[PDB]
Design an enzyme around this catalytic site. Structure first.
Site, PDB file in Angstrom:
ATOM      1  N   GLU A   1      -0.249   4.726  -0.883  1.00 47.43           N
ATOM      2  CA  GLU A   1      -1.009   5.954  -1.034  1.00 47.43           C
ATOM      3  C   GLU A   1      -0.099   7.134  -0.850  1.00 47.43           C
ATOM      4  OE1 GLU A   1      -3.904   4.290   1.893  1.00 47.43           O
ATOM      5  OE2 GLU A   1      -5.283   5.637   0.787  1.00 47.43           O
TER       6      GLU A   1
ATOM      7  N   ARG B   1      -1.924  -2.581 -18.980  1.00 42.05           N
ATOM      8  CA  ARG B   1      -3.095  -1.706 -18.943  1.00 42.05           C
ATOM      9  C   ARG B   1      -2.951  -0.669 -17.831  1.00 42.05           C
ATOM     10  NH1 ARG B   1      -6.154  -4.392 -22.518  1.00 42.05           N
ATOM     11  NH2 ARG B   1      -7.987  -3.028 -22.488  1.00 42.05           N
TER      12      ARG B   1
ATOM     13  N   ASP C   1      -5.022  13.627 -26.118  1.00 42.75           N
ATOM     14  CA  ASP C   1      -5.119  12.213 -25.773  1.00 42.75           C
ATOM     15  C   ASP C   1      -4.465  11.414 -26.885  1.00 42.75           C
ATOM     16  OD1 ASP C   1      -5.770   9.565 -25.079  1.00 42.75           O
ATOM     17  OD2 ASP C   1      -7.815  10.035 -24.572  1.00 42.75           O
TER      18      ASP C   1
ATOM     19  N   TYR D   1       0.836  -1.214   0.000  1.00 40.53           N
ATOM     20  CA  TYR D   1       0.000   0.000   0.000  1.00 40.53           C
ATOM     21  C   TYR D   1       0.867   1.259   0.000  1.00 40.53           C
ATOM     22  CZ  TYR D   1      -5.089  -0.070  -0.046  1.00 40.53           C
ATOM     23  OH  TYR D   1      -6.400  -0.116  -0.473  1.00 40.53           O
TER      24      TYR D   1
ATOM     25  N   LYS E   1      -1.803   0.114 -25.699  1.00 42.75           N
ATOM     26  CA  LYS E   1      -2.067  -0.010 -27.111  1.00 42.75           C
ATOM     27  C   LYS E   1      -0.749  -0.128 -27.897  1.00 42.75           C
ATOM     28  CE  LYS E   1      -6.370   2.546 -26.706  1.00 42.75           C
ATOM     29  NZ  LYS E   1      -6.325   2.880 -25.273  1.00 42.75           N
TER      30      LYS E   1
ATOM     31  N   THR F   1      -2.744   5.968 -22.683  1.00 47.06           N
ATOM     32  CA  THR F   1      -2.723   4.617 -22.169  1.00 47.06           C
ATOM     33  C   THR F   1      -1.370   4.030 -22.461  1.00 47.06           C
ATOM     34  OG1 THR F   1      -3.710   3.770 -24.243  1.00 47.06           O
ATOM     35  CG2 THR F   1      -5.207   4.238 -22.385  1.00 47.06           C
TER      36      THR F   1
HETATM   37  C1  LIG Z   1      -4.066   7.026   3.693  1.00 42.73           C
HETATM   38  C2  LIG Z   1      -5.513   6.680   3.938  1.00 42.73           C
HETATM   39  N1  LIG Z   1      -6.370   6.258   2.976  1.00 42.73           N
HETATM   40  N2  LIG Z   1      -7.691   6.009   3.397  1.00 42.73           N
HETATM   41  C3  LIG Z   1      -7.631   6.314   4.712  1.00 42.73           C
HETATM   42  C4  LIG Z   1      -6.323   6.760   5.200  1.00 42.73           C
HETATM   43  C5  LIG Z   1      -6.039   7.150   6.626  1.00 42.73           C
HETATM   44  C6  LIG Z   1      -5.494   8.591   6.667  1.00 42.73           C
HETATM   45  C7  LIG Z   1      -5.687   9.517   5.631  1.00 42.73           C
HETATM   46  C8  LIG Z   1      -5.151  10.815   5.698  1.00 42.73           C
HETATM   47  C9  LIG Z   1      -5.395  11.729   4.561  1.00 42.73           C
HETATM   48  C10 LIG Z   1      -5.129  11.246   3.287  1.00 42.73           C
HETATM   49  C11 LIG Z   1      -5.355  12.055   2.183  1.00 42.73           C
HETATM   50  C12 LIG Z   1      -5.848  13.352   2.336  1.00 42.73           C
HETATM   51  C13 LIG Z   1      -6.121  13.837   3.603  1.00 42.73           C
HETATM   52  C14 LIG Z   1      -5.896  13.026   4.708  1.00 42.73           C
HETATM   53  C15 LIG Z   1      -6.177  13.571   5.828  1.00 42.73           C
HETATM   54  N3  LIG Z   1      -6.431  14.062   6.834  1.00 42.73           N
HETATM   55  C16 LIG Z   1      -4.419  11.224   6.801  1.00 42.73           C
HETATM   56  C17 LIG Z   1      -4.197  10.332   7.840  1.00 42.73           C
HETATM   57  C18 LIG Z   1      -3.431  10.712   9.091  1.00 42.73           C
HETATM   58  F1  LIG Z   1      -4.331  11.001  10.022  1.00 42.73           F
HETATM   59  F2  LIG Z   1      -2.667   9.703   9.497  1.00 42.73           F
HETATM   60  F3  LIG Z   1      -2.689  11.794   8.939  1.00 42.73           F
HETATM   61  C19 LIG Z   1      -4.740   9.052   7.764  1.00 42.73           C
HETATM   62  C20 LIG Z   1      -5.033   6.132   7.244  1.00 42.73           C
HETATM   63  C21 LIG Z   1      -5.478   4.656   7.166  1.00 42.73           C
HETATM   64  C22 LIG Z   1      -3.580   6.287   6.764  1.00 42.73           C
HETATM   65  C23 LIG Z   1      -7.307   7.053   7.465  1.00 42.73           C
HETATM   66  C24 LIG Z   1      -7.174   7.370   8.686  1.00 42.73           C
HETATM   67  N4  LIG Z   1      -7.036   7.663   9.809  1.00 42.73           N
HETATM   68  C25 LIG Z   1      -8.499   6.627   6.965  1.00 42.73           C
HETATM   69  N5  LIG Z   1      -9.617   6.520   7.683  1.00 42.73           N
HETATM   70  O1  LIG Z   1      -8.668   6.238   5.588  1.00 42.73           O
HETATM   71  C1  LIG Z   2      -8.114   8.100 -26.997  1.00 40.36           C
HETATM   72  C2  LIG Z   2      -8.452   7.116 -25.902  1.00 40.36           C
HETATM   73  N1  LIG Z   2      -8.365   7.483 -24.607  1.00 40.36           N
HETATM   74  C3  LIG Z   2      -8.648   6.701 -23.558  1.00 40.36           C
HETATM   75  C4  LIG Z   2      -9.053   5.373 -23.718  1.00 40.36           C
HETATM   76  C5  LIG Z   2      -9.407   4.570 -22.476  1.00 40.36           C
HETATM   77  O1  LIG Z   2      -8.695   3.376 -22.243  1.00 40.36           O
HETATM   78  P1  LIG Z   2      -9.232   2.352 -21.108  1.00 40.36           P
HETATM   79  O2  LIG Z   2     -10.172   1.455 -21.902  1.00 40.36           O
HETATM   80  O3  LIG Z   2      -7.887   1.777 -20.725  1.00 40.36           O
HETATM   81  O4  LIG Z   2      -9.950   3.074 -20.035  1.00 40.36           O
HETATM   82  C6  LIG Z   2      -9.192   4.834 -25.100  1.00 40.36           C
HETATM   83  C7  LIG Z   2      -9.649   3.414 -25.321  1.00 40.36           C
HETATM   84  N2  LIG Z   2      -9.919   3.037 -26.693  1.00 40.36           N
HETATM   85  C8  LIG Z   2     -10.876   1.988 -26.993  1.00 40.36           C
HETATM   86  C9  LIG Z   2     -10.475   1.328 -28.300  1.00 40.36           C
HETATM   87  O5  LIG Z   2      -9.787   1.964 -29.126  1.00 40.36           O
HETATM   88  O6  LIG Z   2     -10.824   0.165 -28.536  1.00 40.36           O
HETATM   89  C10 LIG Z   2      -8.871   5.745 -26.220  1.00 40.36           C
HETATM   90  O7  LIG Z   2      -8.952   5.337 -27.494  1.00 40.36           O
HETATM   91  C1  LIG Z   3     -13.246   0.625   3.475  1.00 41.39           C
HETATM   92  C2  LIG Z   3     -12.388   0.934   2.285  1.00 41.39           C
HETATM   93  N1  LIG Z   3     -12.952   1.147   1.079  1.00 41.39           N
HETATM   94  C3  LIG Z   3     -12.255   1.426  -0.029  1.00 41.39           C
HETATM   95  C4  LIG Z   3     -10.863   1.537  -0.038  1.00 41.39           C
HETATM   96  C5  LIG Z   3     -10.154   1.903  -1.334  1.00 41.39           C
HETATM   97  O1  LIG Z   3      -9.292   0.905  -1.854  1.00 41.39           O
HETATM   98  P1  LIG Z   3      -8.257   1.325  -2.999  1.00 41.39           P
HETATM   99  O2  LIG Z   3      -7.036   1.719  -2.201  1.00 41.39           O
HETATM  100  O3  LIG Z   3      -8.122   0.008  -3.704  1.00 41.39           O
HETATM  101  O4  LIG Z   3      -8.833   2.459  -3.785  1.00 41.39           O
HETATM  102  C6  LIG Z   3     -10.128   1.334   1.236  1.00 41.39           C
HETATM  103  C7  LIG Z   3      -8.619   1.450   1.310  1.00 41.39           C
HETATM  104  N2  LIG Z   3      -8.078   1.527   2.656  1.00 41.39           N
HETATM  105  C8  LIG Z   3      -6.716   1.939   2.905  1.00 41.39           C
HETATM  106  C9  LIG Z   3      -6.208   1.191   4.119  1.00 41.39           C
HETATM  107  O5  LIG Z   3      -7.032   0.736   4.930  1.00 41.39           O
HETATM  108  O6  LIG Z   3      -4.990   1.032   4.299  1.00 41.39           O
HETATM  109  C10 LIG Z   3     -10.930   1.009   2.419  1.00 41.39           C
HETATM  110  O7  LIG Z   3     -10.325   0.812   3.596  1.00 41.39           O
END
Ligand SMILES: Cc1[nH]nc2c1[C@](c1cc(-c3ccccc3C#N)cc(C(F)(F)F)c1)(C(C)C)C(C#N)=C(N)O2
Ligand SMILES: Cc1ncc(COP(=O)(O)O)c(CNCC(=O)O)c1O
Ligand SMILES: Cc1ncc(COP(=O)(O)O)c(CNCC(=O)O)c1O
Ligand SMILES: Cc1[nH]nc2c1[C@](c1cc(-c3ccccc3C#N)cc(C(F)(F)F)c1)(C(C)C)C(C#N)=C(N)O2
Ligand SMILES: [Cl-]
Lengths: 442, 442
Positions: A56, A243, A208, A54, A237, A234
Site C-alpha cells: 500500500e 489484465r 481511453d 502488501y 488487449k 488496459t
Molecule cells: C495501510 C493501511 N491500509 N488499511 C489500513 C491501514 C493502516 C493504516 C493506514 C494509514 C493511512 C493510510 C492511508 C491514508 C490515511 C491513513 C491514515 N491515517 C495510516 C496508518 C498509520 F497509522 F500507521 F500511520 C495506518 C495500517 C494497517 C497500516 C490501519 C491502521 N492503523 C488500518 N486500520 O487499516
Molecule cells: C475502451 C475501454 N476501456 C476500458 C475497458 C475495461 O476493461 P476491463 O474489462 O479490464 O475492466 C474496456 C473493455 N472492453 C470490452 C471489450 O472490448 O470486449 C474498453 O474497451
Molecule cells: C478488513 C479488511 N477489508 C478489506 C481490505 C482490503 O483489501 P485489499 O488490500 O485487497 O483492497 C483489508 C486490507 N488490510 C490491509 C492490512 O491489514 O494489512 C482489510 O484488512
C-alpha cells in the site's frame, strides 16, 4: 504446514477444466477484438510470489517496509510505460496500480471531477465503454453515470464520431471531462479537434486507448499524448499484457494532477497493489518498446485491412466501409439476421466474435452487427493470405445462419434448436479446428 | 508472431529483482498480520491461460460465447465458497468477481445503499479499514466517505468495541448499513449485538471478515453468517488464497439482494472478471474445507496465544491484554518509543511488522503500537515453542530501539542515522536470517 503438491494432484477437478479451456483456445478462431494471448514470461510474472507482498502506497512512500524490491519493480514499470508511449517522465506521469480498465477509468474520472461531477462520453450502443458514463432510462447502469452526471454523444449514420454534435452538446452541458477512445470504433480519432472543443468549454480531454494502445505506442495512428490531459489503457488487449491498466496524466498541462490521480487509485479506491500484475505489465512493456513488436502491430493492421477487403469482396457491408485499426464491425442488415444469431452460429463452429450495435439500431436490444478484430489471430501467426479463409468462414456462417433462420424462424429460442447436430456446422467446425489447432500457440 | 523465451532470457533485469524478492521472503520473519504465502498450485492458476478470456456477465448469462469452461470454473468457485463458509446455496449467495477487498467493499456498500447512502464503520485509528467510511477533517480520504455519507465509531480505552457508543450513534445517525469486522482488532466480534443495533434502526449488518476468514470458516470463532446481511472477505490473508475478494449476501433475509450485489460488481464497477483469480480462489477454497487446513488455522491461534503469553512474560503490554485471534497489537508507551521507530528497527533485522495506533492515540500522526500476526510464520511450520524466539527477537528490537533513541534523539530523521552499520542489528539480523531461511517455504 502447507500442501506442496502440483495442481493436477491437489485439484484434479479444476485442472481438467483448465486443460479443456486450453484446448478450446488452441482450437478456436478468436476474432474477439479485445482478446489476445499472453506469452509464458508474462504468465511467470503473474504466478510469481511477488503477490505475497502488501505494498500500500507508492515507491519510497510505503506504509510498510521490506518493499525495496517491490519499489524497484513499480518504478521499472512506470519508466517502461512512459518510454513505450513516447513521453518524457518530466512532462508525463503514469499510475500502474489500477487492477483493470474499468477501475482505472473510474479512479481517473474521480480524480479530475469528483462526486456529482459532469462528464461526456460516447454511448455504449454507439461504441463507447460502460465506464464512459453509460446509463439507461431504466437505470444508472455504470457507476460512471451515478457517481458522476453524464451526457452521451453518438456517432452519425455512417458510424463516424460526429464532432459537430459533440461541440453542441459540450456547449449546453458544460462538462469538466470529455472522453474519447472507444470499445468498438473501427476508425482513428481526431484528438486535436477534441482538444479544441475541450479548451472552448474548459474541460479535460480524456483518451481511453485500450483497444488501440499498441498503435498509439508504435506511431502508427494519431497520438493522443500530444493533446490529452489523461490517457488510460488496459494492458490485456492489443498490448498483449496481463489484465491490468495504466493511467497517464499530463503534469505540464495540469499542475497538481499527479497527487489527484495517485490518491484516487490509493487510498480513495484501491488497497494493496497486486505486485504480480505490475511485474507482468513491466515484462510486456519491455517487449512493447522492441522493433519486433512494432512489426507485430503493423501486421495486426495489415491483417485487418486484408480482412475488411476480403469481406467486402464477398459483398459483406462494413460500418464506415473499412477500418483504420485492428477492428471491423459487420453490418448484417442485407442478410436479415441479427448479430446474436451469428454469434450462436459462430460459437457452434469454434469462431469467437460478438454482437455489436450499428448506427441504425435505436437501442442495444437487437444489435444488427458483429464485431471482429485481428490481434489474437495475428499473435497466432496468420498473415494477410490467411484472412481470406476467415472471411470465407464468416460468409459460410452468415449463409448457414440465413438458412437456419429460414427453416426454424426469427425467434432466437426457435433458431438455436436448428444448431445442434446440423451437418454443415459439424463440417465447418472441423475445418476451423484443423486450421486453428495447427497455428503457433504461446 | 510472439516471443516464447522464459522470463530469465527475455527479461533478465526483472527476473533478478524477482529472485531477490524471493530471497527476502525466505529470509524474513514476517509478522504482517495480513500476509501469507500461497502454494504452488494457487500460483499455477494465477499464471494460467484462463486469463486470456473475456467473460463479462455471470455463468449462463454471458455477453460472449466460448464461456463453457469458464462458467464451470466460476460456478465451482461459488459452490466451494459456500461450502467452506458453512452456508447453503438456498439461503446464501456469493459473488467471486471482485478484484480485491476494497473493490468488494465499495461494490457491496453501493449495492445496499447507493450514492449519498448513510454508513457506519469503525475508524481507521481504532482498527477499521479505509473502505469502512474513513475520512479526515482535512479531506474525504476513502471513496466510502465521499460517495456515501459516513459516521465512524471508536473502540473504548481498553481497545474493545464499545457497543453502547455504536448504538448511541446508530440511533442518532440512522444509517442504512453498519459495518463490523476489522483490519487490526485483536478480539472476536459480537455479531448478535451488532444485529440487535441494526434491527433497531432498520440498518443492514455488514461483516468484513478478511483478517479472520479462516476462523469463521472452521467454526473456531463466532459466525457472522447467523446474523449478517452481507459478509465480505479477501482471499489473500489468513485464507491463504490469491489476491481477490468474495461478497456473501443473504437471500432469505433480503429478497432482491442477489441482483443488487451482482449488478454492483458488474456492470456498475467492474468489467471482465480475472479468470485466473477465480481459478486460484477455487483451488484454495477446496483446501480451506479440508481438516488439514482446520489444523493449520488452529495452529495459527495456538501460535498467537503463545506469542502473546511470551511477550507478556517479557513485560510487554498488549492492547486488550491478549488476543482471541491471529493478531496482536503491542502497546509501546512504557518504552517511550513510537511504532514508527520499531518498524524501522525491525526492517533492519529482517522482521516485518507495521505500526498501528492504540486507543490512547488521538491521531494517526504518531502511532504508539505495532501490529503482529501469526498466519505467515504458521505457514512456514513455526509451532508454539518457536514463538519464544520471536518474542525474544522483538524484545531485543525494542531495547535496541530504546538505546538508539537515547543516543541519536526522538526525531525520526536522527534516529534512522543510527541504524546502518550497527553491530547489534547485524548480529540480530544474521540470527533472524539463519532461523528464517531454514523454515519450509512454499
Ligand atoms: C495501510 C493501511 N491500509 N488499511 C489500513 C491501514 C493502516 C493504516 C493506514 C494509514 C493511512 C493510510 C492511508 C491514508 C490515511 C491513513 C491514515 N491515517 C495510516 C496508518 C498509520 F497509522 F500507521 F500511520 C495506518 C495500517 C494497517 C497500516 C490501519 C491502521 N492503523 C488500518 N486500520 O487499516
Ligand atoms: C475502451 C475501454 N476501456 C476500458 C475497458 C475495461 O476493461 P476491463 O474489462 O479490464 O475492466 C474496456 C473493455 N472492453 C470490452 C471489450 O472490448 O470486449 C474498453 O474497451
Ligand atoms: C478488513 C479488511 N477489508 C478489506 C481490505 C482490503 O483489501 P485489499 O488490500 O485487497 O483492497 C483489508 C486490507 N488490510 C490491509 C492490512 O491489514 O494489512 C482489510 O484488512
Ligand atoms: C460487454 C461489453 N463491455 N463493454 C462493452 C460491451 C458491448 C455491449 C454491452 C452491453 C451491455 C452490457 C452491460 C449492461 C448493459 C449493456 C447494454 N446495453 C450490451 C451489448 C449488446 F449489444 F450486445 F447487447 C454490447 C459489446 C462489446 C459486447 C458494447 C457494445 N455494443 C460496448 N460498446 O462496450
Ligand atoms: Cl492477477
Amino acid at each position: 504446514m502447507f500442501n506442496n503438491e502440483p495442481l493436477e494432484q491437489i485439484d484434479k477437478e479444476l485442472h481438467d477444466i483448465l486443460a479443456d479451456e486450453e484446448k478450446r483456445q488452441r482450437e478456436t478462431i478468436n476474432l474477439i477484438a479485445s482478446e489476445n494471448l499472453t506469452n509464458g514470461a508474462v504468465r511467470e510474472c503473474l504466478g510469481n510470489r511477488v503477490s505475497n507482498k502488501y505494498s500500500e502506497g507508492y515507491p519510497k512512500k510505503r506504509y510498510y517496509g521490506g518493499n525495496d524490491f517491490i519499489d524497484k519493480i513499480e518504478e521499472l514499470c512506470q519508466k517502461r510505460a512512459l518510454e513505450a508511449f513516447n513521453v518524457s517522465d518530466e512532462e508525463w506521469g503514469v499510475n500502474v496500480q489500477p487492477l483493470s480498465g474499468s477501475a482505472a477509468n473510474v479512479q481517473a474520472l474521480y480524480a479530475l471531477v469528483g462526486v456529482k461531477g459532469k462528464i461526456m462520453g460516447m454511448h455504449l450502443c454507439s461504441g463507447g465503454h460502460l465506464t464512459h458514463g453509460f446509463f439507461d432510462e431504466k437505470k444508472k447502469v455504470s457507476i460512471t453515470s451515478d457517481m458522476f452526471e453524464s451526457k452521451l454523444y453518438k456517432c452519425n449514420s455512417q458510424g463516424y464520431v460526429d464532432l459537430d454534435a459533440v461541440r453542441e452538446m459540450a456547449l449546453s452541458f458544460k462538462p469538466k471531462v470529455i472522453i474519447c477512445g472507444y470499445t468498438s470504433y473501427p476508425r482513428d480519432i481526431d484528438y486535436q479537434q477534441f482538444r479544441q472543443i475541450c479548451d472552448e468549454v474548459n474541460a479535460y480531454l480524456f483518451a481511453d486507448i485500450s483497444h488501440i494502445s499498441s498503435f498509439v505506442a508504435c506511431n502508427i495512428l494519431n497520438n493522443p499524448f500530444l493533446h490529452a490531459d489523461v490517457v488510460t489503457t488496459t494492458t490485456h488487449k492489443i498490448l498483449r499484457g496481463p489484465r491490468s491498466a495504466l493511467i497517464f496524466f499530463n503534469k505540464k498541462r495540469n499542475p497538481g494532477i499527479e497527487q489527484k490521480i495517485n490518491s484516487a487509485v490509493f487510498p480513495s479506491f484501491q488497497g494493496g497493489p497486486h505486485n504480480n500484475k505490475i511485474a507482468a505489465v513491466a515484462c510486456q512493456l519491455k517487449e512493447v518498446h522492441s522493433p519486433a513488436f512494432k512489426e507485430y502491430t503493423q501486421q495486426v493492421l495489415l491483417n485487418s485491412k486484408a480482412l475488411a477487403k476480403a469481406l467486402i469482396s464477398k459483398q459483406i457491408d462494413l460500418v464506415t466501409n473499412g477500418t483504420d485499426n485492428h477492428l471491423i464491425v459487420v453490418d448484417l442488415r442485407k442478410f436479415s439476421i441479427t448479430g446474436s444469431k451469428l454469434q450462436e452460429t459462430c460459437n457452434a463452429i469454434n469462431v469467437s466474435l460478438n454482437k455489436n450495435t450499428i448506427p441504425s439500431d435505436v437501442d442495444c436490444v437487437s444489435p444488427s452487427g458483429v464485431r471482429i478484430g485481428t490481434p489474437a489471430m495475428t499473435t497466432r501467426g496468420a498473415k494477410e493470405k490467411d484472412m481470406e479463409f476467415i472471411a470465407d468462414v464468416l460468409a459460410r456462417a452468415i449463409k448457414i445462419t440465413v438458412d437456419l433462420q429460414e427453416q426454424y424462424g426469427k425467434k432466437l429460442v426457435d433458431f438455436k434448436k436448428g444448431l445442434p447436430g446440423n451437418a454443415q456446422l459439424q463440417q465447418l467446425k472441423q475445418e476451423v479446428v484443423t486450421w486453428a489447432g495447427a497455428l503457433p500457440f504461446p
